[PDB]
Amino acid sequence: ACARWPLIIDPQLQGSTWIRGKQGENLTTISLSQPKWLGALTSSISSG
Amino acid sequence: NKRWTQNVKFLKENIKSMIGDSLLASAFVSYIGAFSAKLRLELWKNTWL
């Protein structure tokens, strides 16, 4: 029920594993250090 | 009739009571989330409710 974007503080990776569970299909994981990350986000924003 | 009047009267009390709820819910979703178990509990149960 989030109005603002959910930024999650997760050491021990409980949050991460649960988002992969809840959002099973087409949850495309993108480290900020990914090389073409701007392209992968802007394509997922448009239809993802 | 008796079981649909009871569902009405309860739902009418369930509008006004889901107006005072939503305040707590909203207050809780917006801010609480950065805090730890003990403190989170002290904000909505010891101060707000």
PDB file of N, CA, C and O in Angstrom, chain B residues 6-41:
ATOM      1  N   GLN B   6     -29.214  -6.188   9.996  1.00  0.00           N
ATOM      2  CA  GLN B   6     -28.024  -6.353  10.879  1.00  0.00           C
ATOM      3  C   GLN B   6     -26.742  -6.074  10.086  1.00  0.00           C
ATOM      4  O   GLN B   6     -25.836  -5.447  10.661  1.00  0.00           O
ATOM      5  N   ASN B   7     -26.671  -6.525   8.830  1.00  0.00           N
ATOM      6  CA  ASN B   7     -25.521  -6.283   7.913  1.00  0.00           C
ATOM      7  C   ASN B   7     -25.453  -4.799   7.530  1.00  0.00           C
ATOM      8  O   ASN B   7     -24.331  -4.270   7.453  1.00  0.00           O
ATOM      9  N   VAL B   8     -26.602  -4.164   7.285  1.00  0.00           N
ATOM     10  CA  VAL B   8     -26.702  -2.698   7.025  1.00  0.00           C
ATOM     11  C   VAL B   8     -26.153  -1.961   8.253  1.00  0.00           C
ATOM     12  O   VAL B   8     -25.059  -1.384   8.133  1.00  0.00           O
ATOM     13  N   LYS B   9     -26.867  -2.021   9.387  1.00  0.00           N
ATOM     14  CA  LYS B   9     -26.575  -1.259  10.637  1.00  0.00           C
ATOM     15  C   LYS B   9     -25.092  -1.404  11.006  1.00  0.00           C
ATOM     16  O   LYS B   9     -24.481  -0.374  11.361  1.00  0.00           O
ATOM     17  N   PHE B  10     -24.541  -2.621  10.923  1.00  0.00           N
ATOM     18  CA  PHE B  10     -23.103  -2.915  11.176  1.00  0.00           C
ATOM     19  C   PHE B  10     -22.225  -2.200  10.137  1.00  0.00           C
ATOM     20  O   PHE B  10     -21.199  -1.624  10.551  1.00  0.00           O
ATOM     21  N   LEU B  11     -22.594  -2.241   8.849  1.00  0.00           N
ATOM     22  CA  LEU B  11     -21.817  -1.592   7.753  1.00  0.00           C
ATOM     23  C   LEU B  11     -21.834  -0.067   7.918  1.00  0.00           C
ATOM     24  O   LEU B  11     -20.790   0.547   7.657  1.00  0.00           O
ATOM     25  N   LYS B  12     -22.961   0.518   8.343  1.00  0.00           N
ATOM     26  CA  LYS B  12     -23.090   1.977   8.619  1.00  0.00           C
ATOM     27  C   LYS B  12     -22.129   2.369   9.750  1.00  0.00           C
ATOM     28  O   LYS B  12     -21.478   3.425   9.620  1.00  0.00           O
ATOM     29  N   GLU B  13     -22.032   1.552  10.803  1.00  0.00           N
ATOM     30  CA  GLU B  13     -21.014   1.697  11.881  1.00  0.00           C
ATOM     31  C   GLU B  13     -19.615   1.359  11.339  1.00  0.00           C
ATOM     32  O   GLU B  13     -18.635   1.818  11.951  1.00  0.00           O
ATOM     33  N   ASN B  14     -19.529   0.569  10.258  1.00  0.00           N
ATOM     34  CA  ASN B  14     -18.264   0.159   9.583  1.00  0.00           C
ATOM     35  C   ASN B  14     -17.823   1.187   8.527  1.00  0.00           C
ATOM     36  O   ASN B  14     -16.719   1.010   8.003  1.00  0.00           O
ATOM     37  N   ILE B  15     -18.623   2.211   8.204  1.00  0.00           N
ATOM     38  CA  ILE B  15     -18.128   3.370   7.398  1.00  0.00           C
ATOM     39  C   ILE B  15     -17.329   4.266   8.349  1.00  0.00           C
ATOM     40  O   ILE B  15     -16.095   4.331   8.183  1.00  0.00           O
ATOM     41  N   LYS B  16     -18.009   4.876   9.330  1.00  0.00           N
ATOM     42  CA  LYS B  16     -17.444   5.889  10.268  1.00  0.00           C
ATOM     43  C   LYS B  16     -16.215   5.328  10.992  1.00  0.00           C
ATOM     44  O   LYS B  16     -15.292   6.114  11.269  1.00  0.00           O
ATOM     45  N   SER B  17     -16.210   4.033  11.311  1.00  0.00           N
ATOM     46  CA  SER B  17     -15.089   3.362  12.013  1.00  0.00           C
ATOM     47  C   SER B  17     -13.949   3.050  11.037  1.00  0.00           C
ATOM     48  O   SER B  17     -12.818   2.865  11.523  1.00  0.00           O
ATOM     49  N   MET B  18     -14.227   2.996   9.727  1.00  0.00           N
ATOM     50  CA  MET B  18     -13.197   2.865   8.657  1.00  0.00           C
ATOM     51  C   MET B  18     -12.825   4.258   8.114  1.00  0.00           C
ATOM     52  O   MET B  18     -12.253   4.325   7.009  1.00  0.00           O
ATOM     53  N   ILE B  19     -13.129   5.320   8.877  1.00  0.00           N
ATOM     54  CA  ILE B  19     -12.666   6.730   8.677  1.00  0.00           C
ATOM     55  C   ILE B  19     -11.587   7.057   9.713  1.00  0.00           C
ATOM     56  O   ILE B  19     -10.618   7.762   9.359  1.00  0.00           O
ATOM     57  N   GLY B  20     -11.811   6.637  10.962  1.00  0.00           N
ATOM     58  CA  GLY B  20     -10.836   6.724  12.063  1.00  0.00           C
ATOM     59  C   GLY B  20      -9.717   5.720  11.891  1.00  0.00           C
ATOM     60  O   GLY B  20      -8.591   6.030  12.331  1.00  0.00           O
ATOM     61  N   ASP B  21     -10.014   4.557  11.298  1.00  0.00           N
ATOM     62  CA  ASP B  21      -9.014   3.499  10.998  1.00  0.00           C
ATOM     63  C   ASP B  21      -7.998   4.081  10.013  1.00  0.00           C
ATOM     64  O   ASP B  21      -6.794   4.088  10.327  1.00  0.00           O
ATOM     65  N   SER B  22      -8.495   4.554   8.869  1.00  0.00           N
ATOM     66  CA  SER B  22      -7.705   4.919   7.667  1.00  0.00           C
ATOM     67  C   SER B  22      -6.649   5.960   8.046  1.00  0.00           C
ATOM     68  O   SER B  22      -5.563   5.931   7.439  1.00  0.00           O
ATOM     69  N   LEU B  23      -6.973   6.835   9.007  1.00  0.00           N
ATOM     70  CA  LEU B  23      -6.051   7.846   9.588  1.00  0.00           C
ATOM     71  C   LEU B  23      -4.843   7.110  10.166  1.00  0.00           C
ATOM     72  O   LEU B  23      -3.716   7.478   9.800  1.00  0.00           O
ATOM     73  N   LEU B  24      -5.082   6.100  11.013  1.00  0.00           N
ATOM     74  CA  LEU B  24      -4.025   5.292  11.684  1.00  0.00           C
ATOM     75  C   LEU B  24      -3.206   4.559  10.619  1.00  0.00           C
ATOM     76  O   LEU B  24      -1.969   4.705  10.625  1.00  0.00           O
ATOM     77  N   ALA B  25      -3.890   3.815   9.746  1.00  0.00           N
ATOM     78  CA  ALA B  25      -3.325   3.062   8.599  1.00  0.00           C
ATOM     79  C   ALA B  25      -2.382   3.951   7.779  1.00  0.00           C
ATOM     80  O   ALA B  25      -1.221   3.552   7.579  1.00  0.00           O
ATOM     81  N   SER B  26      -2.877   5.105   7.321  1.00  0.00           N
ATOM     82  CA  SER B  26      -2.138   6.073   6.471  1.00  0.00           C
ATOM     83  C   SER B  26      -0.918   6.601   7.230  1.00  0.00           C
ATOM     84  O   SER B  26       0.200   6.506   6.687  1.00  0.00           O
ATOM     85  N   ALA B  27      -1.145   7.140   8.432  1.00  0.00           N
ATOM     86  CA  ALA B  27      -0.104   7.628   9.369  1.00  0.00           C
ATOM     87  C   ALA B  27       0.983   6.563   9.506  1.00  0.00           C
ATOM     88  O   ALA B  27       2.174   6.922   9.514  1.00  0.00           O
ATOM     89  N   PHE B  28       0.567   5.299   9.595  1.00  0.00           N
ATOM     90  CA  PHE B  28       1.444   4.126   9.836  1.00  0.00           C
ATOM     91  C   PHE B  28       2.249   3.771   8.583  1.00  0.00           C
ATOM     92  O   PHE B  28       3.454   3.517   8.719  1.00  0.00           O
ATOM     93  N   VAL B  29       1.601   3.702   7.420  1.00  0.00           N
ATOM     94  CA  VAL B  29       2.243   3.323   6.120  1.00  0.00           C
ATOM     95  C   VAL B  29       3.279   4.378   5.704  1.00  0.00           C
ATOM     96  O   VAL B  29       4.379   3.978   5.265  1.00  0.00           O
ATOM     97  N   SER B  30       2.921   5.661   5.797  1.00  0.00           N
ATOM     98  CA  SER B  30       3.744   6.809   5.339  1.00  0.00           C
ATOM     99  C   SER B  30       5.076   6.852   6.107  1.00  0.00           C
ATOM    100  O   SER B  30       6.127   6.702   5.452  1.00  0.00           O
ATOM    101  N   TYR B  31       5.047   7.031   7.432  1.00  0.00           N
ATOM    102  CA  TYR B  31       6.249   7.322   8.260  1.00  0.00           C
ATOM    103  C   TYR B  31       6.883   6.019   8.757  1.00  0.00           C
ATOM    104  O   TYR B  31       8.025   5.727   8.343  1.00  0.00           O
ATOM    105  N   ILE B  32       6.179   5.280   9.624  1.00  0.00           N
ATOM    106  CA  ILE B  32       6.670   4.022  10.267  1.00  0.00           C
ATOM    107  C   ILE B  32       7.116   3.053   9.170  1.00  0.00           C
ATOM    108  O   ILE B  32       6.353   2.867   8.205  1.00  0.00           O
ATOM    109  N   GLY B  33       8.296   2.456   9.333  1.00  0.00           N
ATOM    110  CA  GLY B  33       8.949   1.633   8.296  1.00  0.00           C
ATOM    111  C   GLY B  33      10.460   1.709   8.382  1.00  0.00           C
ATOM    112  O   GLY B  33      11.118   0.703   8.055  1.00  0.00           O
ATOM    113  N   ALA B  34      10.991   2.861   8.798  1.00  0.00           N
ATOM    114  CA  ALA B  34      12.436   3.104   9.011  1.00  0.00           C
ATOM    115  C   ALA B  34      12.851   2.691  10.432  1.00  0.00           C
ATOM    116  O   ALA B  34      14.067   2.483  10.641  1.00  0.00           O
ATOM    117  N   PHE B  35      11.894   2.569  11.362  1.00  0.00           N
ATOM    118  CA  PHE B  35      12.138   2.342  12.813  1.00  0.00           C
ATOM    119  C   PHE B  35      12.282   0.838  13.094  1.00  0.00           C
ATOM    120  O   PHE B  35      12.129   0.049  12.161  1.00  0.00           O
ATOM    121  N   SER B  36      12.588   0.471  14.344  1.00  0.00           N
ATOM    122  CA  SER B  36      12.774  -0.924  14.831  1.00  0.00           C
ATOM    123  C   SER B  36      11.591  -1.339  15.721  1.00  0.00           C
ATOM    124  O   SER B  36      11.011  -0.456  16.382  1.00  0.00           O
ATOM    125  N   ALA B  37      11.282  -2.641  15.752  1.00  0.00           N
ATOM    126  CA  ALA B  37      10.133  -3.275  16.449  1.00  0.00           C
ATOM    127  C   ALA B  37       9.630  -2.415  17.619  1.00  0.00           C
ATOM    128  O   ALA B  37       8.484  -1.935  17.532  1.00  0.00           O
ATOM    129  N   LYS B  38      10.454  -2.239  18.661  1.00  0.00           N
ATOM    130  CA  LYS B  38      10.088  -1.571  19.945  1.00  0.00           C
ATOM    131  C   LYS B  38       9.531  -0.171  19.671  1.00  0.00           C
ATOM    132  O   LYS B  38       8.453   0.151  20.207  1.00  0.00           O
ATOM    133  N   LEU B  39      10.261   0.620  18.882  1.00  0.00           N
ATOM    134  CA  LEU B  39       9.940   2.043  18.594  1.00  0.00           C
ATOM    135  C   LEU B  39       8.675   2.112  17.727  1.00  0.00           C
ATOM    136  O   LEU B  39       7.763   2.876  18.095  1.00  0.00           O
ATOM    137  N   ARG B  40       8.612   1.315  16.651  1.00  0.00           N
ATOM    138  CA  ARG B  40       7.447   1.222  15.722  1.00  0.00           C
ATOM    139  C   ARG B  40       6.176   1.049  16.559  1.00  0.00           C
ATOM    140  O   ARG B  40       5.233   1.827  16.360  1.00  0.00           O
ATOM    141  N   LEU B  41       6.195   0.095  17.491  1.00  0.00           N
ATOM    142  CA  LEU B  41       5.071  -0.236  18.411  1.00  0.00           C
ATOM    143  C   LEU B  41       4.725   0.970  19.296  1.00  0.00           C
ATOM    144  O   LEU B  41       3.522   1.198  19.513  1.00  0.00           O
TER     145      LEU B  41
END
